[PDB]
Design an enzyme around this catalytic site. Structure first.
Site, PDB file in Angstrom:
ATOM      1  N   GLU A  98       0.778  -1.220  -0.003  1.00  0.00           N
ATOM      2  CA  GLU A  98       0.019   0.227  -0.157  1.00  0.00           C
ATOM      3  C   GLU A  98       0.968   1.321  -0.106  1.00  0.00           C
ATOM      4  O   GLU A  98       1.477   1.560   0.975  1.00  0.00           O
ATOM      5  CB  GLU A  98      -0.802  -0.192   1.345  1.00  0.00           C
ATOM      6  N   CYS A 133      -1.233   9.026   1.983  1.00  0.00           N
ATOM      7  CA  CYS A 133      -1.182   8.430   0.743  1.00  0.00           C
ATOM      8  C   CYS A 133      -2.403   8.815  -0.267  1.00  0.00           C
ATOM      9  O   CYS A 133      -2.037   9.060  -1.434  1.00  0.00           O
ATOM     10  CB  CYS A 133      -0.779   7.169   0.850  1.00  0.00           C
TER      11      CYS A 133
END
Lengths: 457, 454, 456, 455
Positions: free
Chosen positions: A229, A263
Site C-alpha cells: 500500500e 497516501c
C-alpha cells in the site's frame, strides 16, 4: 536508512533514541511470533473476535495518552490524533462483529456437498509500517490479520518507536497472547533477515514506493506474498456543473488533512476550464484561512511536518515546479523557527510535465491543472504512475459513473470526501502497489484458501 | 529454444529467441488489444470463450498429437488434457460472468459498491508439463475479467505454443488479447519492467518463481506463483486399502510423474505399511512404459534429458543416504528419454527423496508410528501444494485436514485441479490461487465506488 | 546441483555428503578468522616455507591425488598426473619469486617520505569448479596465502572427495588451522558467508551464471571479487601459417580435458585459402584420438564430468545442425553406463549459430571460414566472451597488430595457449574480470596501503 | 529530480529534466564510437590531450571555482584550490602516465612473453557533489590516458558544474564521446550498466549507492572501483607534538565544511594528553569563520544539501541522547542558508552514533584511549577503512601501528590528503579498488598476456 530517534517536530527537541534490535532480539521476536501462532491458530474465530473487542476496550482506556504520543512524535494536530484513536478502536469492534462470518467455509458446485473452500491462517505476517498514522496504519492490517488466525510482527517507522512501545503495552493489557502481536526495532538488515526466515509466511508494507519496491523484491525472492500500500497522487476532478462550494470544502479537507501527509490525499486538482478560476479563488482563500501552529492547540488545523528531511524534499519539489513554470498562489516557504513547519501552499498552471504533477507531494502543497473538458480531465487523471484513489465532482450522475469505470485507481469518490473505511476495499494500482485492505479483502489476503474435497472418485 | 522428441531423441525444430523488435511488437499489440477488450461486455467475452472451446474441439487430435510429440505424454493423457481445457472454456463462459457482478457493501442506502475492473496486460510464464491446460487454466479467467494475456512458453514446447495461438486466432480472439512471444530470460525481464505489463503469473519451478517474483516485486507488480510440490499422501491403519493403492498409483504416476501436485511422499501408518508397500510396488511394476503413441502404455519417456539426469542423481543420493530401492531406479538404455518406474522405501525426513521435489516416476515411502507422527511428517516440508489422507474415520480426517499446511486436501479420493475449486499452495509452492472465482479475481483491480460520502 | 559424487566412466555412485549446517558454516568462518589473525603476523619467509611444504606434501601424495581427480570427474589419468605436477611446481615458483612482489614500493614523493605497502586483506572466500579440482584451487590459494590472507573454499559438489584430500594434504604440510579450509556449503550457505564481515573478498572460477550470481552478492556487500568465467576462444589460422604446428596446437587446444577447459580453443577461424587443408588435417587428427576408460593411459579422451552437461552439449550440437552446420565427425552420445560423447567437428559454422555464440564445454570443434585477416579479426571479436586467443601466421608484424586488437586477456602467437605462473590469466566481457597468476593474482587480494610520514 | 539550489541563500539556480531514452542512447552510441577511434591513438597523442585539458581548465579557472561554490557551498578559496589541483593532475599524468603503459617483461625465456596494458572500453562513472571537478578528473584523467572513453552521471545538484566541465573539455579538443556526460536518473544508470557498450564502472559516493551499483555491475560481469565513505581515525599519543596534532586535526575535520570521505572524523586521544588536545581543538574550531562562501577569508561555508544537514543534526542529537558531551555547536544556524555550527562531541564511546556512523559535516568526535594498544583497537573498530592519521614521537611504534591499521592510507605526523603520486582508496565498507598513481591507470586496463612461440 534513517536514524532510530524520536524528535518532536513542533519543537525540534530530542525525545528518545532506541538502539536497533540485536541478533538475539530478532531471534526472540521470531521465535515468540511462531510459538504464539502455533497456539493462536487453534483458537475459535469467536475467541479471536473477543480478543479484538478487548483490544478496542484497552485502546479506549488509554485513548488520550495514545493521541498525545502520536502528536508528540510526529506532529499531527491533537484533534486528528484523537480521531485516529477513535477510528482504530471502532475498527476492532467492526471486525469483531462482521469478520467471523467472512471466515465461514464456502460451498462449491461439486455435487453432493463433497467439496468446500476453507479460509485457514498462513502463519506469522511481517508488517513494515510508516509514521503518518502510527496507530491506524498498524491496526488497519493487524485487526483482520489476527482475526484470520495469524500472528503479526511489526517493524515500525524509526521516528515513532514511542508509539510502537505504547501500542504493544495496550495490546498486552488487552490480553493478546504473547507473540500473537509483537514488534521489533529492526534495522534494514534485520528486516531482510526476517523476510528470509521460514517463520515469516508473508509480508505487508505501507509506505513509500522505494520501500515497497525494496521489500517486494525480497519477498518475491523468498516466495512470500505481499500486500503493498504505497504512495498516491490522487486526482480530484471538478467539472463545470459541480456543486462548487462542496467541491472546495472536500478539496481542502482532502489535501490538507494530517498536514497533507496522506497516501490517499487529494493531490492533483483537475478543474474544467469554465469553473477553474472560481474554484482556484475559493480554494486559495480557504487554504489561506487554515490555522497552523502548536499541534497541542485543538484549533490549529495544520501541524509541523513529521520529518525535517521530508520538509526539505517537499520544498525542493515546490522549487522545481516554480522553476518549470508553475504559478505560486500561496505559501511555498519553510517557516522560520526550530519547528518543522511548511506554509500551506497552492501551485496553479500546473501542466503534466511538471514535478508537482508527476511526483507525490507528501505535505501541504496543492497542484491545480486546468482541463479542456471532461475527456481531457479523465486523460489528465490517468496520466500518472500512481493509482490509489480519485474524486469526481459533477452533477452528471451517468457521466460520473462512466468516468469511475475508466479511472485507473482502486477507489473513486463521487461528490464526496474520500477516506478509508472498514466496509470497503482500500488499495491501488500501478506504483501505488497491489493487494487490498479492509472489508473481506484485508481478511482474506493473509489466508491459506484451502480446498477440502471428500470422496473424489 | 530447441524441440526434441523425448521418445526418439530426435530434433523437431529450433526457434530463435525473439529480438528487440519482436518483444516491442508483442507488448504494443497486447496493450492496444487490452485498450479495446476492456471496453467489451462480459457477454461478448464469454461468447469468445465458447468460440475458443469450439475451435479446440475442432483441432483436438492435432493438439493432442503435438503435446505428445514435443514432451512425451501418453496420447490418452494428451487427449484428456484437450478435453479438460475445452470444458474449462465452457465452464467459465457459464459461471464466470456472475463473478464479475458489482458487490454491495454495508454502507447504508446503496451509496457504495465494489467493482471488479480489468487490470491490463498479464504476462504469463508457463511450463511444459501440461502445455495447453496450464496456459488455459490461467488465460480463460484472465481474458474473461477483461485483461489481455501475453505468454512466454517453455522453450521445448514452442510447437504447442504456435498451435495454441493458431487455434485462438481461428476462434476469433482479437489480436493482442491472447498472444505469445519466444522471449529469452533477458526478454522476460524487459517485459516485467515495461509499464504495459500490469501483473505476472508463473507456473513452474521454485527457482523460476523466485527469480520472476523478485523482478515483479521490484516493479511493484503483483504475481501468482504456482510452483512445485512434494505432496504428502497419508494412509492410516483403517484406510480402504484397495482405493488407497489405486489413488496412490494414479497420484504418483500420471504424466510419468511430472505433475506439481503429484502424490510424492507416501506416509503410511505402521499397521498398514507393509501391505500398502507390497501392493503399491506390484501396481507400479505392472505399469506399461514405451512409445506414447501406443495406447497400452501408461508411462512415456520423461520430457527433458537433463531432468532425467537430475532425477537419477536424486535417486542415487537417496540410496546412498540409506533408502531401500524396491523397484526401478535406472535410466532405460536407448535413444529415448525413459526412466524406470521407481519405488524407494525406508525414506526418512533427512533424505533427498523426502526433502526435494522428485519430478518423475519415483515414489518415496515413509513409515509413521501413529497419526500424530503422520501429520508431523506431512508438514515437514518446504512445499505445501496439496495433500491426500486415507482413513475410514471422517472426524479424524477433518481434524487432520485443518492442520495440514497445504492449499488442497483430498480425503479418500484422487487429487486433481478442477475449475470448481481453488488451486495453489503455501510455503515454497508459491502463493495466490487459480480457478473458481479466485483465478478470475486475482487479476482484477478491485475498485470501491462511493457516491455522496459526506 | 546435488551434493553427490558419481564416477562418470561407470555411472556409479561414489559418495554423498550432506550440506554444511549452520554450526558448520559458523565454525568454518570462525576458524578462518582466527587463522588469519595469526597468519597476518607471520613473516613472508615463514609463509614461503609453508608453500614449499605444500609442494612437498603434494608430491608425496601425487598418485593418490591424480587417481582421485580421475575417479570423480573423468580426466584421463596422464592429464590428472600433469595437473598434480603443475600444481606442485606452482608452490615452488611462488615460494621463490613471490616474496619480492610484497616489497614496499617507493613513490615519487621526495626524500623517501611515502611508500606503498601490500597488506593482507583477510579471509578470501573461493568458489571453484570441477574441471581442474586441484589446479584451480591452488592457482588462487597459493598467492592468496603468500599475501597473508586465509582462504576458505566452497568446492564443486561433484568433487568433494578431491576437496577432502586437498585439505588432508595441506594439513600434512603444516598449513595452520583456518589459513586453508573448506566447507560443503549450499547456495544459501555461500550467500550467508559472502554477507558475513569475516569474509573480506571473493574469488570465483566457473560458469557465467555462477559468476553473475556471486558477483551481484559481493558487490552488494561492498566486497571485491575476481571472476574467471567461461570462454569461447578463437583460434585463427591465416594462409601463411605453419600448418603442421597449427593443427597440432588446434587439436591439443580443443580436446585437452575432453574439451572441458574455459580457455580451450573453441572457435576455429580459418582463412579461405587454407580452410580445406586445415579442416582435412584437423578432422583426421580428431578421428585418431583414443576414447575410453580414463584409468587407461593410452586413452586421450575420457567421459565428460556431468551427465546433464553432456545432454546440454548434445542439444547445442543438435541446434547447430538444425541451423545449418555440417557435421564432419561425431555428434553422438556413446551408448553405455558412462558419460561419453564422441569427438566432434562442426564445419560451415556462421556467426548466427549456437556453435559460434555459446560456449561448447566438451569435445566439439566449430570451424568457420574467414575471407581474409580483417574478417578473421572481426569474427574472433564477435563473441560475448573474451578469455584467450591464438593466431597462427608467419607475418610477425601482422600477428602483433592483431594481438593488440583482440578483445581477450591472453594472445598466443604460433604456439599452444596455457595458464602459467609467470604471466597474467583472465579475460574481459562475459569471461569476467580481474587477473590471476604472476604478481596480479598476488596483489588482487592485498590492501594496497599508502604510508606517508611528515606530510606538512 | 535534478535541481540546483545555492546552499548559501536557499535560492533556486536551475532545474534540469532527466535524460530521456533517446538521450541515453545517444550518450552510449557516442561513447562507443569515440572509444573505437580513441583506442587507436598513440599514448603521446592522448598525453597531449591531457595537457590541452589542463590548459583549458586554467583558462576558465575562476568561472569553474565560482560554479563549484555557487552550486554546493564550498568556500571560494577551496574551490579555487580544487581547480588548481585538478589541472595539475592533467599535467602529472601527461608526464608520468605514458611510461606506466609500457609492456612488462616476464620471466618466460628469451623475451617470448610480455604483459600489455590495453584499453578496456567505455567506463561509466557515478560521481558525487563534494568535489564536483576533482572527483571527476581524479578518475577521468588516467581512464582517458589508458585509451578508454569516460561517460559521466554527475550528482543531480551539480549539473551546472557538469555542463561547464563538458564545455571546457570540448574546448580543449577532447574528441566527441571520449569524454561525455548524461543527466540520467536511477533507471537510466541501471540501463547503462546493463548495456554491452559499458565495459566497467567507477563510483565515488555513499555506501548505499556503492552497494546498489556494485550489485548491478557484478550481475553484469563488469568490474568496479568503489570509493565510498570513511570514518577516519586520528590517533594522538602522549608524546605527540600537540600543537601540530591539533592543527592537522582541525584541518582534517573541517576542510570542505567536513564533507570529505577521507576527513579526520574520530579523534582517539591517549588519556595523558586528552584534555590538553580537547581544550586546544575546541578553541581552534570555535575560532573558524563561518559564512558567505564568496568571502575569501571564511573557513566554513553552508553544507551542500538541506536534507544532509538535517541528517547530520539527528546524528548529533542521537549521540548526545546516548551520553556524548556537547562542547561546541550542535545547532543549525537560523536563516535561509544551510549552515551548521562547527561542533565538537566529547566522551564518545564505541557504541555511539558519532563513533559508528560517518558524520559528513563539521562535527568532531573525541574518544579517550587508555594507551596505544587501546587506541589501535578503537581505530579498527569501524565498518569503514579509508585512511588514518597517527601523531607520536615514537617512529617505530607509528610504523608498527600503520601495518596494523585496517585502512588504505596512513599519515604519520602530518596532514592526510589525496595526491597523484600515491594510491587512494580503502577497505571494508569504504569500498575496494585504488585510484591515482599507476593504480588508477591500470584498474581500467585489459591486462593482456602476449606470448609468442609457446613451444
Amino acid at each position: 536508512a534513517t536514524q532510530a530517534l524520536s524528535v518532536n517536530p513542533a519543537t525540534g527537541q530530542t525525545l528518545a533514541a532506541m538502539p536497533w534490535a540485536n541478533a538475539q532480539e530478532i531471534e526472540h521476536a521470531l521465535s515468540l511470533a511462531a510459538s504464539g501462532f502455533k497456539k493462536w491458530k487453534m483458537t475459535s474465530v469467536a475467541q479471536r473476535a473477543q480478543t479484538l473487542r478487548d483490544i478496542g476496550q484497552a485502546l479506549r482506556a488509554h485513548a488520550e495518552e495514545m493521541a498525545q504520543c502520536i502528536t508528540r512524535e510526529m506532529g499531527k494536530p491533537i484533534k486528528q490524533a484523537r480521531a485516529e484513536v477513535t477510528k482504530s478502536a471502532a475498527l476492532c469492534d467492526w471486525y469483531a462483529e462482521h469478520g467471523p462470518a467472512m471466515l465461514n467455509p464456502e460451498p462449491t458446485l461439486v455435487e453432493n456437498q463433497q467439496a468446500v473452500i476453507e479460509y485457514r491462517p498462513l502463519g506469522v505476517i511481517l508488517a513494515i509500517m510508516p509514521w503518518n498514522f502510527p496507530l491506524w496504519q498498524v491496526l488497519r492490517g493487524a485487526v483482520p490479520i489476527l482475526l484470520a488466525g495469524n500472528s503479526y510482527l511489526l517493524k515500525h517507522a524509526p521516528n515513532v518507536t514511542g508509539c510502537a512501545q505504547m501500542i504493544a503495552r495496550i495490546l498486552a493489557e488487552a490480553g493478546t497472547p504473547a507473540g500473537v502481536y509483537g514488534w521489533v526495532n529492526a534495522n534494514n538488515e534485520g528486516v531482510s533477515q526476517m523476510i528470509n526466515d521460514p517463520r515469516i509466511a508473508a509480508v505487508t508494507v505501507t509506505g513509500s514506493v522505494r520501500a515497497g519496491a525494496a521489500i517486494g523484491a525480497q519477498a518475491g525472492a523468498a516466495l512470500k506474498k505481499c500486500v503493498l500500500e504505497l504512495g498516491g497522487s490522487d486526482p480530484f476532478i471538478v467539472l463545470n456543473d459541480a456543486d462548487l462550494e462542496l467541491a472546495v470544502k472536500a478539496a481542502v479537507a482532502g489535501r490538507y488533512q494530517n498536514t497533507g501527509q496522506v497516501c490517499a490525499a487529494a493531490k492533483r486538482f483537475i478543474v474544467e476550464e469554465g469553473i477553474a478560476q472560481a474554484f482556484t479563488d475559493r480554494f486559495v482563500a480557504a487554504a489561506a484561512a487554515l490555522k497552523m501552529g502548536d499541534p497541542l492547540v485543538e484549533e490549529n488545523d495544520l501541524g509541523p511536518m513529521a520529518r525535517f528531511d521530508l520538509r526539505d524534499e517537499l520544498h525542493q519539489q515546490v522549487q522545481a515546479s516554480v522553476a518549470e513554470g508553475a504559478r505560486l498562489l500561496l505559501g511555498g516557504e519553510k517557516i522560520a523557527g526550530e519547528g518543522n513547519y511548511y506554509a500551506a501552499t497552492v501551485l496553479a498552471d500546473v501542466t503534466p510535465d511538471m514535478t508537482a504533477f508527476r511526483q507525490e507531494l507528501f505535505g501541504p502543497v496543492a497542484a491545480i491543472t486546468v482541463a479542456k473538458d471532461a475527456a481531457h480531465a479523465l486523460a489528465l487523471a490517468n496520466d500518472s504512475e500512481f493509482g490509489l484513489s480519485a474524486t469526481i465532482f459533477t452533477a452528471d450522475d451517468t457521466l460520473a459513473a462512466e468516468m469511475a469505470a475508466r479511472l485507473e485507481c482502486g477507489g473513486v469518490f463521487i461528490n464526496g470526501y474520500s477516506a478509508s473505511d472498514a466496509r470497503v476495499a482500500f488499495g491501488g494500482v500501478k506504483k501505488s502497489g497491489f493487494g487490498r485492505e479492509l472489508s473481506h479483502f484485508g481478511l482474506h489476503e493473509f489466508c491459506n484458501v484451502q480446498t477440502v474435497w471428500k470422496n473424489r472418485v
